[PDB]
């Protein structure tokens, strides 16, 4: 069996004096369709396989490509994927939760460099021979994240920097908690990183979370991002403030809310402030295939 | 929701005395398959997504890859659309009515240069920041189209040169009327191009009609299309006469005829002869699935 | 209608001593999805188009495209192709039933050039003009292919080398029978190469085989590949030894098996020894959607 499945989202994205003799405001739009082919056993067992085509504005050549194959095999709970995977770091609940704005963006998010899903093909040739291997679990409200990524699969490893992930979230109705560690994360040697992170359910309607990150070697250093979110109805407002060790930075923060036009369609805005006092701010809409 | 639907066709096309060493006579061919992803909701508001994948006979690579993303949203007849855009010169109707053969193709199509639906990638970079804006609305048989296409929007907008477009058509059963104008069309200071057309339904079976443009700053000058079709059984009869204004330039005209061989599966051929006394000719099959 | 199929693979790979600096073990892995537009009509005859998305590991900028497309016309047992065709001496049985592995490989195949359908794109640009026509016909057990490749159709025909192949296959349950001959394979000037097997099914759970070639310009000379398979319930086992008369080869073989784990899976493995005594392993699965 074959499915497809996508999205579409376009909107306005401003940049505070983005740059000179460009214009600071531009529509920004990204189209995302998934291709999943799948084999379905007696015994249990599925096998799967993914490709990604996706579409952005300002991407070179005006065209669209499909990025490199991901294959897993899952049973009983257990996946095993290889090839283009998705990785512990980049995997675990809570880390992205800070995110607003119709482009899913936020300076909370974690400042480090670290290998995840690739969703285009890359002209450099840098991830020709790049194979991971990602095994998760989930067992009762608990999951289990691991993944290993080697960047160049065909040369000898003594001379490959490979990077090894592990993650593991665990939730209940009012708490969850979460933590990561990547070691050499995205190839380059001594960068670990880590992440713990904490949220509570204090309403049906809100929710207010601690992350907290060792960025590696980033000149970020150690960050600390406080965020929350509250429902009223259709409408989510979200907020969130974030630190960063680096000598000199701005506190960032951001303040955005979504509103569910209908099942498959949000329409997000943001404004939000960076760690250099960059200004930026969104207003879009996605909708869902 | 997700559909793909598309066409391909084959056949002979035929230029007399190509080129030195060339074959005048080649087997021309194109695969076109179109994604569309749909978002419906209960407001009555449509959103859509549309990617396109061509391929024709002679493309480099010999590879197939997809184009720049369309948006749009619908609402109460009236379409907002974004990104890579129907224009309104390319959309009217009657315009490119003389058209003909497998190809459908016709000396009496406009001479000028405008900005149009990009079916595919451009591997020079000139379509990478290119956005345009589209608006139509159809009211009891008569549509409205306006476009705006920027062709590079993340430069400051007094350095580059915008194409602003718009048209209209109208008919009933037996007479259609039809008026474009587009400024600085294809992102040319000062190419201001225009057209006005009309077509009568002479019989439930034959038409003829006028098509006259102004091809703005190309060589051709103003341009005069007489064309006529007439359907007898599955088989219809095509010819049209052109004239440009260019100094010296001949006549063109062309013949042809289609044959509706089942549902979906079309037969057609075309001898036609150029403002410069080229010769062409085809004959193929197209075939909808 | 348009119908989506295609596969997935991974597994490990192994060549002994592989190259300095190169690990002789590695994962391999391919997707290919096939895009078929199909246009069914009420006289009988039907019209098709394909595509293919293949991706590969090691494959260039990790990302996946289309190939050139492919054209069919079919009626009454007859089919007509056009564009990037399937070849006769591709195409005819029992030529490539020595393979075995995940990979389905095998030094019993012929070691000769030739044009077949091309499954990628191809960067070099050789393919941009290259056109094929194709004709089979399957009567009573029997089929008939012929094909003839331009390898660039624009240009005057007696400056081009064109391949032409004929092939004919014919079995009843117990013995089959094929041949085929090609001239100026692969577009290469007298490079005229030949094929000829039988097969013969010694129990509804065996068979042995003998396929014969004349390699054409290639250094091996003339090839003989003997091999057999034998299953066993869900297990089959395969083997095959080859010769070529290249002065000073070695005699090629392989040992495999493969195992149908359920309808749409296949687990294999094989491990083999070329003409020049490379050793090669493999063991992977294949899952059809
Ligand atoms: C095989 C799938 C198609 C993907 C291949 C595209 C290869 C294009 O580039 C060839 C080398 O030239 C460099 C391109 O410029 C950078 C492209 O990507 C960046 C922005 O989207
Ligand atoms: C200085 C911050 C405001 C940016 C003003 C520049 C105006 C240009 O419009 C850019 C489009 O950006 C959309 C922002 O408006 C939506 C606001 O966010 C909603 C929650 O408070
Ligand atoms: C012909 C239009 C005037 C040319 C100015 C172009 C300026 C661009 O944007 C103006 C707003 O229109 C278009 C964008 O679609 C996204 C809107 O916001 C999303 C839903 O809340
Ligand atoms: C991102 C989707 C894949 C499209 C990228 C293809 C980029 C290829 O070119 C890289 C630059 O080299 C120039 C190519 O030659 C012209 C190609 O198009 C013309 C005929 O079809
Ligand atoms: C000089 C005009 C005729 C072209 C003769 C060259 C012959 C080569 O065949 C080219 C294939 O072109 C197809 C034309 O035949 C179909 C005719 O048009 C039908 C309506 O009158
Ligand atoms: C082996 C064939 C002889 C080699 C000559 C190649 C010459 C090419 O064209 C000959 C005609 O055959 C093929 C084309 O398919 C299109 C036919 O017209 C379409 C339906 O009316
Ligand atoms: C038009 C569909 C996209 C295919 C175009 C890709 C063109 C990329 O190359 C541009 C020229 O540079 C050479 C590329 O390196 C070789 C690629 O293929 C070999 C391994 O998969
Ligand atoms: C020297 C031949 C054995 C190769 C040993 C190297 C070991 C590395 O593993 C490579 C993975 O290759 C898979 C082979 O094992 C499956 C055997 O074939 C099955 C039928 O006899
Ligand atoms: C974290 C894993 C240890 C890193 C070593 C990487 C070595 C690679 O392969 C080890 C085996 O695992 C993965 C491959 O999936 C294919 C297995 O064989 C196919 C079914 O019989």
Redesign the interface.
């Known amino acids: ?2 499915s ?5 989202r ?1 909107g306005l994205q401003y940049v505070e004096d983005r740059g000179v ?3 600071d405001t ?2 920004s ?3 995302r ?1 998934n ?1 999943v ?3 379905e ?3 249990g ?1 599925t ?3 993914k ?1 990604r ?1 996706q ?1 952005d ?13 991901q ?1 897993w ?1 899952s049973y009983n709970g257990v996946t095993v994927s ?3 995977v998705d990785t512990a770091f980049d995997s675990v609940a809570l880390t992205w939760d800070s995110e607003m704005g119709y482009e899913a963006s936020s300076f909370g998010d974690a400042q480090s460099s670290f290998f995840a899903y ?1 969703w ?4 450099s ?1 840098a ?5 991971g ?1 990602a095994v998760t679990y989930s067992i009762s409200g608990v999951n289990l994240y691991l993944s290993y990524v080697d960047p160049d ?5 003594s ?1 490959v920097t490979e990077e090894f992930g592990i993650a593991a979230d665990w939730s209940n109705d009012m708490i969850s908690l979460a933590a990561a560690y990547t070691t050499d994360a995205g190839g380059i040697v001594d960068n670990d990183i880590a992440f713990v992170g904490a949220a509570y359910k204090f309403n049906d309607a809100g929710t207010v979370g601690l992350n907290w990150y060792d960025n590696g070697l980033s000149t970020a250093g150690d960050q600390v991002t406080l965020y929350g979110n509250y429902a009223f109805g259709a409408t989510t407002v979200r907020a969130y403030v974030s630190d960063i060790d680096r000598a000199g930075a701005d506190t960032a923060y951001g303040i955005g809310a979504d509103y569910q ?5 949000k329409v997000s805005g943001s404004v939000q402030s960076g760690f250099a006092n960059e200004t930026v701010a969104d207003v879009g ?1 996605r ?3």
Chains 1, 2, 3 share one sequence.
């Open positions: 069996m074959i497809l499945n996508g999205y579409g376009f003799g460009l214009e531009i529509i739009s990204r189209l369709i291709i082919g799948t084999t056993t007696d015994q067992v096998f799967g396989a490709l085509m579409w504005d300002g991407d070179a050549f005006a065209g669209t490509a499909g990025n490199a194959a294959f095999t290889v090839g283009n690739n285009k093909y890359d002209a040739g991830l020709d021979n790049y194979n291997i699969q065909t040369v000898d490893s001379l036009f209908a099942e498959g369609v809409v909708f869902d295939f």
